[PDB]
Design a protein around this ligand. Structure first.
Ligand SMILES: CCCN(CCC)C(=O)c1cc(C)cc(C(=O)N[C@@H](Cc2cc(F)cc(F)c2)[C@H](O)[C@H]2C[C@@H](Oc3ccccc3)CN2)c1
Length: 390
């Protein structure tokens, strides 16, 4: 590992998001910021809110510049409205550089901030095409690269604990690493396999085959990417297009049929619990997603365990039982490879070479019998046809 200064700089968990510490303004104002590869705006709370114990105070920054323009971002989940401006930004546990970046000062929000998450803003790491108001508002990473010598690449290791973390624990625990400008080899095992970034807006990729315990889901691969497939640290679950979700759940139910679970569990709403240490991991299937490779007619696969798609949650009775929620749900906006999926791998966002790399994470949760995996190559034809076109 050659980036020790950035190793272990993240905190959080899949259900509330992973964040990195940043500073904005002069003198520096420290804020915790949600790492979101699923959007492209850098925005921070800039006014009191019930769930924030601190926020950006523009009047106290000598380097603050007002862009005299409003901005509104309606995400799938929540929304915020704010005022645009620029200011000096740094990442304490990151590259030792300071850059002038666009900042949306949030003045109003609805279902955006999360009670107890410990973050006060969001860092959209995707491309300008999806930035609000429009693509003229340069994203943070683009500014960082244009203004410094930092290589055009970042990598993420999100570390799920494998069990519930209470308020005190989640504040003291290391949640992972965000390596800005490089790849740290201590964060993964095995080889890195790369899939092309189909188009630069979201970090869009193409899934060409799906297996549940090795059994082909057997759908037209176009269905897997309808209307797109993205890698999104800003979403907890693996979200799947309606028809794919229905087929996946049917197959996962069949594989785990030795135990019956309530509909509320499969809807991702209610938790299921087992006596301490008795979670029957072995009855649940592994899930493999084959992604387009960099070489013609070649693909590779990433395999996740139920230790990834079953999200640890504290029992309503704070008992000693081990409980979880099903972290796979349906989408009407394409496949979303969220945090629970990223927790199994070290993910390299190689913007310079327009590709995304995957490798088994040194911190993924597993058991003595199975492990997550990244394997290849496989001969796969007409993969271009797996991509969707409106
Ligand atoms: C992460 C903590 C738990 N959580 C949020 C609270 C329930 C989710 O799992 C979740 C669930 C859904 C169904 C959507 C989004 C969602 O919209 N996430 C976006 C980021 C985000 C928004 C928010 F309000 C609170 C957050 F904690 C995180 C991300 O950019 C998604 C949205 C879409 O891309 C865009 C849509 C519109 C504009 C720009 C990007 C694909 N990436 C997030």
């Amino acid at each position: 590992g050659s980036f020790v200064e950035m190793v272990d700089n993240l905190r959080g968990k899949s259900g509330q998001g992973y964040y990195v510490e940043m500073t904005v303004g002069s003198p520096p104002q420290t804020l915790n910021i949600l790492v979101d590869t699923g959007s492209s705006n850098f925005a921070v709370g800039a006014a009191p809110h019930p769930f924030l114990h601190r926020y950006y105070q523009r009047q106290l920054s000598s380097t603050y510049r007002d862009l005299r323009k409003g901005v509104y971002v309606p995400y799938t989940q929540g929304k915020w409205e704010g005022e645009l401006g620029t200011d000096l930004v740094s990442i304490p546990h990151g590259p030792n550089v300071t850059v002038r970046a666009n900042i949306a000062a949030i003045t109003e929000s609805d279902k955006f901030f999360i009670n107890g998450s410990n973050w006060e803003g969001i860092l959209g790491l995707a491309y300008a095409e999806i930035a609000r108001p429009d693509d003229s508002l340069e994203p943070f990473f683009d500014s960082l690269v244009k203004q410094t010598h930092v290589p055009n690449l970042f990598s993420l290791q999100l570390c799920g604990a494998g069990f519930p973390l209470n308020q005190s624990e989640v504040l003291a625990s290391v949640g992972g690493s965000m390596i800005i400008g490089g790849i740290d080899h201590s964060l993964y095992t095995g080889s890195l396999w790369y899939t092309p970034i189909r188009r630069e807006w979201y970090y869009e990729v193409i899934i060409v085959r799906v297996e549940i315990n090795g059994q082909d889901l057997k759908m037209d691969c176009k269905e897997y990417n309808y209307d797109k497939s993205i890698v999104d640290s800003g979403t907890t679950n693996l979200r799947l297009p309606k028809k794919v979700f229905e087929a996946a759940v049917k197959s996962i139910k069949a594989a785990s049929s030795t135990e019956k679970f309530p509909d509320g569990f499969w809807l991702g709403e209610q938790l299921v619990c087992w006596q301490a240490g008795t979670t029957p991991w072995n009855i649940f299937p592994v899930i493999s997603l084959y992604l387009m490779g960099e070489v013609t007619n070649q693909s590779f696969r990433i395999t996740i365990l139920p230790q990834q798609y079953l999200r640890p949650v504290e029992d309503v009775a704070t008992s000693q039982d081990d409980c979880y929620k099903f972290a796979i749900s349906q989408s009407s906006t394409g496949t979303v490879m969220g945090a629970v999926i990223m927790e199994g791998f070290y993910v390299v966002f190689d913007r310079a070479r327009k590709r995304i790399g995957f490798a088994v994470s040194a911190c993924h949760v597993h058991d003595e019998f199975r492990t997550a995996a990244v394997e290849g190559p496989f001969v796969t034809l007409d993969m271009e046809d797996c991509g969707y076109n409106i």
